[PDB]
Design a protein around this nucleic acid. Structure first.
Ligand SMILES: [Zn+2]
Ligand SMILES: [Zn+2]
Ligand SMILES: [Zn+2]
Lengths: 285, 96, 94, 113, 366, 198, 62, 34
DNA sequence: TTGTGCTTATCGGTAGA
RNA sequence: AGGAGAGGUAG
DNA sequence: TCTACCGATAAGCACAACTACCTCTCCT
């Protein structure tokens, strides 16, 4: 599966503060949401300005209102761009050595003055005493799409995070069952690369906010790969819960022992085999 | 209905209930991130624009799926009360 | 919107949403009848009929061999594999 | 992304940079004509997200997310628990403050934190 | 004639893979700009004026510039002289099954036969590219297969026509084989076999397998059906039906649902339930199928006020709406409203064929 | 740097919790060590060397497990050979290796070739951030000894193969350090069940 | 006339049936044929148009 | 139980230096029908 | 036509001798 | 006697 | 410094796309 739906629950110490759950959930959503650089910038243009510097400097103008709404600053986005340029640096397979980004409130651009409260971001390409990057097509086709795809917030793995409300969660709390209705977050992550597990990347992204997310009840929504994270028993329990939910949605009434027998039959060899012929053959083997 | 006057009253009540349900759906359609500046407790001069644009709400609803789900949920919630009128306008001898 | 698009960029797809004020006793408007036919055309299709049968057959092929033993355990017919040590029923007759 | 035709032969011009001239120039390959450039602009594109054309209506891309709803808070005018909460700035205040909107169809009341 | 907009994969490196405009004519894959300059165009500005995009979009301009660069790189000095004609002739001759005609004659009959002039077809190509760019930018809606506006139905004038054509071709093949076998080593009646076509028609009517409209093999089914004699209503509704052929029965698309184009043409409230749910549509009571008109409408259009298409490509159109007759650019009109009003007035006086559709849209300006 | 310090603190806390759950006589001071106390005892730089320690079983002092932290990621055959030579010199039969990146296939083959003589367990640093055992979905796991396994097999009169199976790659099996041929006891919130490691 | 899109109103039908001497709602008082007692609720009666299908009983006997 | 069709006659001329081709089924009440 | 499993076939890949 | 193409009934 | 198997991607190549029944019409 490419969606790889996750489920994160809030910790119990946030209830002491007034409206602590809502503030914590909003902070987690703001921190762990992918925001592309193209969504913030409005007008991107290349201006001919004339380690030595190369010509064809790029201009990115961003309105201050957009930054105010997103609670960001020009210095923060410049730092994020530099960090992401130095993080991978796998693309841009050309004569590139360093990339320095400068911030200016007002730029010497007389082409248009429609917006007076727009901050300009200047990106300058550096060449190692060569004119291999002197053409405009190469930069326009490689560097411009690279910066627009760079996320200024969140992580490249997380697709979208939505805040939901539930009354019968899959992972019940030990004590304090009197609380009728809690608040949790659902996280969807990209599955472009299967080399690394989505949960592994999610744990590394939440390092600054490890205390906020209650890891005692957080669990992936998937069934197949949840056994590799929390064991076969947790996957069986989540499968039973999902089967009960499906039966309830169907409108019919089914006794518990049937569903328990189904769960124990489909997970007898330590893994949830499929209903196809290959799964049965593997189970018999 | 017992007579023609009761039928006319029921027709008017149904029309008003449908209008109220449509208004409720239009109000519920505003629960998005685009109208966070308008939903806040402040001074906005575009109050009349959200009301006068009656023919655009249906077009915006038919294009989005989440908006359609919210609209149908609100319509069911507001139409339960409309369906509740059968016990008021229906006699005890009604076979249905 | 019924005439292709409303011209507000040109759209290509729509999610129909209509409210019919009239009832069956009064008489359906031809456009209302068209809307009702469009809405109800889904129930007349022959699709999705094979899914319950295929699912039932594939589940039967897995759960046919399961039977209860004289010792009280739940065992599979292939090799007497132990599925459950004790039946998880909540009573009342064993 | 800009283009212009030289007045000599009416053909497209490609931008180029000369180290000695230190100025932007345009010359076409059809005729040996070089003209001075204006505004020193070789590319100007408004950033838009209209990449998946004729595909955003069928598949829900979720361009505008829905606001979250909570049931812990209780409304004042009516005794309804469901409400919409979000963060937005005030008229003149700084920072983000929490807001609440009642979900009761008959109430229509909004209050701050 | 196919104009395709896609990323360039021929003689393109990793850095340059932007979208370019290509032409698929006689399986030659000719760049669009070479074809533009081959059809009596000697200026880039004139070619841009022919493609009257009338909009400000960066993607369209980038695609046009990329196409120009691809055309320049493919053929050197193509603008000067007639190198584009030589290049397209070489591309045509490079096909597995090239036409017997030369380049000077292939462009007159195999390329837009409706337009006689070699420069008017260039304007038609420019209009086609303009429509493609408008559709790509989102200003123009794409055609849908569910609507009846873009669909036609054939009952007997075209279904039997292709069967007759293929049976006659087979009979001609057999006759020429017999003639070659008999010439080397007889009345004309013995040379032509009179049973082949009759047997083929009998087989087609009995088995019900009809020839595919676009494929020699893979005969279609469900074309010929039996009548019902249980009651006259059954045999009346069996005669008045419309069938649409789909690749698979499990999924079709949006054809199974009613469309606003069904208003007054086919019955949207009645349709068979089952596998062919919505594919078979019963025709309405006031439903008629138009037939080909033997009279010539072109001669009567100039009398109403239509102005002929300009031959020169340098002269642009200011506000003259385009007039298309059966997909052919026949001329231009100054005012569309008065023109269509006069056409309708002439039609209502029995001066024009009674089965003729007159469409006027201000969005497309045609 | 401080992020790496707190990451290593979490890893050490989870490792100590796992060792205490496995019964290796972990002191309460190490279990109840706070982040501030850990940083104060850490010093200026850890260099992934102060985490190396040796622990012995509570019941028997002869059995001991040594925890090894490599200095750099992407270890090779030479590092594994040095580690196994150190194990042979110190006379230890079990070891836990916590690495930052996935092991070299040659290193994996070397580990699998010498698995008969000594048992080696590998753990990623990302997997030890959250304690698997301390979860509401995971039930109580109890490892049965040889005598209890024999009693279980004799009571139901069943073979080892005719039992529900659990793979070695499962996180619980690696958390409890279970080898092939051992049964476990599971209590669900009561009916119990047993799983056979295969 | 019973034109599908030109159906007469319900009030017109009720008035037409009332002018014929019957109840305006289409229901008439009936008496049980087995005992002769009068039923408490009126029964709706009307000459509808029915059809006979080609599916018979003996055609399905196997 | 025979085919209701009509014969086709067209002149064919051969040069060096009305024949029957086939029968098309005839629809009832067509341009050629009794 | 698709919808997933399933077995060849090619691009690079880093590690150890 | 045996196979392929259509239409139809029940859940 | 020259070879081993080893990760992800293209391209064929397969099975599978509901039960229970009834007619007619065409071959072979
Ligand atoms: Zn600037
Ligand atoms: Zn020039
Ligand atoms: Zn309220």
């Amino acid at each position: 599966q490419r969606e790889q739906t996750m489920s994160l629950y809030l910790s119990e110490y946030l209830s002491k503060k007034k409206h602590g759950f809502e503030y914590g959930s909003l902070e987690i959503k703001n921190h762990l949401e992918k925001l592309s650089f193209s969504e913030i910038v409005s007008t991107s243009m290349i201006i001919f300005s004339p380690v030595p510097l190369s010509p064809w400097v790029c201009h990115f103008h961003i309105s201050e209102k957009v930054l105010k709404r997103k609670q960001l600053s020009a210095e923060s986005v410049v730092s994020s761009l530099n960090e992401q340029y130095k993080s991978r640096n796998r693309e841009l397979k050309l004569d590139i050595v360093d990339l320095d980004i400068q911030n200016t409130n007002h730029c010497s651009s007389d082409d248009q003055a429609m917006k007076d409260d727009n901050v300009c971001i200047t990106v300058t390409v550096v060449e190692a005493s060569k004119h291999s990057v002197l053409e405009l097509d190469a930069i326009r086709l490689v560097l411009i799409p690279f910066l627009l795809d760079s996320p200024v917030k969140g992580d490249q793995g997380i697709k979208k995070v939505n805040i939901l409300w539930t009354d019968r969660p899959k992972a019940p709390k030990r004590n304090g069952n009197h609380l009728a209705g809690e608040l949790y977050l659902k996280v969807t992550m990209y599955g472009d690369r299967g080399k690394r597990n989505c949960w592994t990347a999610l744990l590394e992204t939440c390092l600054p906010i490890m205390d906020m997310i209650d890891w005692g009840r957080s669990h992936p929504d998937n069934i197949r790969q949840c056994c590799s994270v929390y064991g076969i028993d947790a996957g069986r329990s989540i499968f039973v819960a999902n089967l009960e939910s499906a039966v309830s949605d169907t409108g019919k009434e089914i006794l518990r022992e049937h569903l328990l027998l189904v769960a124990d039959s489909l997970s007898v060899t330590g893994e949830f085999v499929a209903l196809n012929a290959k799964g049965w053959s593997k189970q018999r083997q | 209905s017992s007579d023609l006057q009761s039928r006319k009253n029921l027709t008017e009540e149904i029309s008003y209930g449908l209008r109220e349900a449509e208004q409720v759906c239009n109000k519920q359609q505003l629960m998005v991130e685009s109208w966070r500046d308008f939903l806040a407790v402040n001074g906005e001069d575009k109050e009349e624009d959200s009301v006068s644009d009656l023919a655009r709400f249906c077009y915006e609803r038919q294009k989005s799926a989440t908006l359609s789900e919210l609209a149908v949920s609100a319509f069911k919630d507001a139409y339960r009360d409309v369906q509740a009128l059968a016990y008021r306008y229906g006699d005890q001898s009604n076979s249905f | 919107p019924l005439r292709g698009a409303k011209g507000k960029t040109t759209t290509e797809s729509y999610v129909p949403y209509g409210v019919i004020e009239n009832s069956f006793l009064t008489g359906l408007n031809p456009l209302e009848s068209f809307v009702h036919s469009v809405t109800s055309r889904d129930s007349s299709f022959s699709g999705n009929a094979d899914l319950p049968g295929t699912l039932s057959r594939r589940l039967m092929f897995f759960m046919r061999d399961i039977y209860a033993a004289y010792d009280g355990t739940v065992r599979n017919s292939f090799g007497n594999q132990l599925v459950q040590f004790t039946y998880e029923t909540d009573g009342p007759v064993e | 992304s800009t283009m212009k035709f030289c007045r000599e032969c009416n053909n497209i011009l490609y931008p180029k940079e000369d180290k000695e001239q230190k100025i932007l120039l345009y010359a076409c390959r059809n005729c040996d004509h070089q003209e001075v450039a204006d505004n020193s602009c070789v590319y100007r594109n408004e950033v838009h997200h209209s990449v998946s054309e004729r595909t955003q209506i069928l598949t829900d891309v979720a361009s505008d997310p829905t606001l979250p709803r909570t049931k812990a808070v209780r409304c004042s005018k009516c005794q309804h628990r469901e409400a919409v909460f979000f963060q937005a700035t005030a008229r003149g205040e700084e920072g983000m403050t929490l807001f609440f909107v009642c979900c009761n169809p008959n109430c229509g009341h909004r209050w701050r934190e | 004639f196919i104009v395709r907009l896609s990323e360039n994969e021929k003689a393109e490196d990793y850095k340059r893979r932007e979208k370019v405009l290509t032409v698929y004519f006689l399986s030659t894959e000719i760049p669009v700009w070479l074809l533009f300059f081959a059809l009596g165009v000697s200026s880039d500005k004139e070619a841009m004026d022919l493609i009257a995009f009338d909009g400000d979009d960066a993607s369209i301009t980038n695609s046009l510039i990329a196409s120009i660069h691809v055309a320049d790189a493919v053929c050197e000095a193509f603008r000067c002289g007639n190198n584009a004609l030589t290049y397209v002739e070489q591309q045509i001759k490079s096909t597995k099954f090239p036409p017997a005609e030369s380049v000077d004659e292939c462009l007159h009959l195999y390329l837009f036969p409706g337009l006689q002039s070699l420069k008017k077809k260039a304007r038609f190509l420019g209009y086609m590219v303009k429509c493609l760019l408008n559709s790509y930018a989102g200003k123009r809606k794409c055609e849908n297969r569910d609507s009846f506006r873009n669909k036609r139905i054939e009952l007997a004038g075209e279904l039997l026509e292709r069967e007759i054509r293929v049976h006659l071709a087979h009979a001609r093949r057999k006759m020429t084989r017999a003639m070659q076998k008999h010439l080397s080593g007889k009345p004309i009646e013995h040379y032509l076999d009179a049973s082949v076509i009759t047997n083929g028609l009998s087989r087609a009517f009995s088995t019900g397998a009809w020839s595919h409209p676009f494929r020699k093999m893979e005969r279609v089914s469900g074309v010929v059906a039996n009548l019902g004699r249980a009651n006259p209503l059954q045999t009346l509704i069996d005669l008045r039906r419309t069938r649409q052929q789909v690749l698979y029965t499990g999924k079709v698309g949006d054809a199974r649902y009613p469309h606003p184009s069904h208003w007054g043409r086919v019955c949207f409230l009645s349709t068979p339930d089952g596998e062919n749910c919505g594919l078979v549509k019963n025709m309405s009571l006031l439903g008629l199928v138009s037939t080909q008109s033997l009279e010539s409408v072109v001669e009567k259009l100039f009398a109403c006020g239509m102005e002929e298409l300009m031959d020169d490509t340098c002269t642009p159109l200011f506000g003259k709406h385009k007039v298309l007759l059966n997909g052919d650019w026949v001329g231009l009109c100054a005012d569309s409203e008065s023109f269509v009003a006069e056409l309708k007035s002439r039609r209502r006086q029995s001066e024009l064929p009674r089965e003729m559709e007159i469409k006027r849209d201000k969005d497309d300006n045609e | 740097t401080e992020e790496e310090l707190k990451r290593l603190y979490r890893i050490q806390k989870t490792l100590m919790q796992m060792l205490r759950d496995r019964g290796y006589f972990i002191a309460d001071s190490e279990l109840t060590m706070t982040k501030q106390q850990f940083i104060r005892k850490h010093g200026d730089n850890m260099k992934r060397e102060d985490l190396v320690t040796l622990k012995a079983k509570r019941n028997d002092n002869s059995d001991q497990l040594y925890i090894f932290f490599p200095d750099e990621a992407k270890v090779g055959v030479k590092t594994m050979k040095m580690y196994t030579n150190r194990m042979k010199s110190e006379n230890v039969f079990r070891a836990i290796l916590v690495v930052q990146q996935n092991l070299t296939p040659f290193a994996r083959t070397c580990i699998s070739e010498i698995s008969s003589k000594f048992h080696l367990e590998v753990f990623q640093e990302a997997e030890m951030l959250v304690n698997i055992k301390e979860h509401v979905l995971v039930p109580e796991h109890q490892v049965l000894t040889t005598e209890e396994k024999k009693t279980l097999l004799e009571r139901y009169t069943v073979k080892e193969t005719q039992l529900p199976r659990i793979q070695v790659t499962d996180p619980i099996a690696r958390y409890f350090g279970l080898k092939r041929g051992q049964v476990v006891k599971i209590i669900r919130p009561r009916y119990v069940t047993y799983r056979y490691v295969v | 006339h019973a034109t599908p899109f030109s159906t007469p109103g319900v009030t017109e039908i009720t008035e037409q049936l009332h002018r014929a001497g019957f109840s305006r709602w289409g229901n008439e008082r009936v008496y049980n044929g087995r005992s002769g007692e009068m039923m408490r609720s009126m029964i709706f009666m009307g000459p509808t148009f029915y059809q006979r299908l080609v599916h018979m009983s003996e055609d399905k006997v196997k | 139980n025979m085919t209701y069709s009509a014969r086709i006659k067209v002149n064919v001329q051969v040069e060096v230096f009305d024949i029957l081709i086939g029968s098309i089924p005839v629809m009832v009440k067509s341009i050629l029908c009794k």
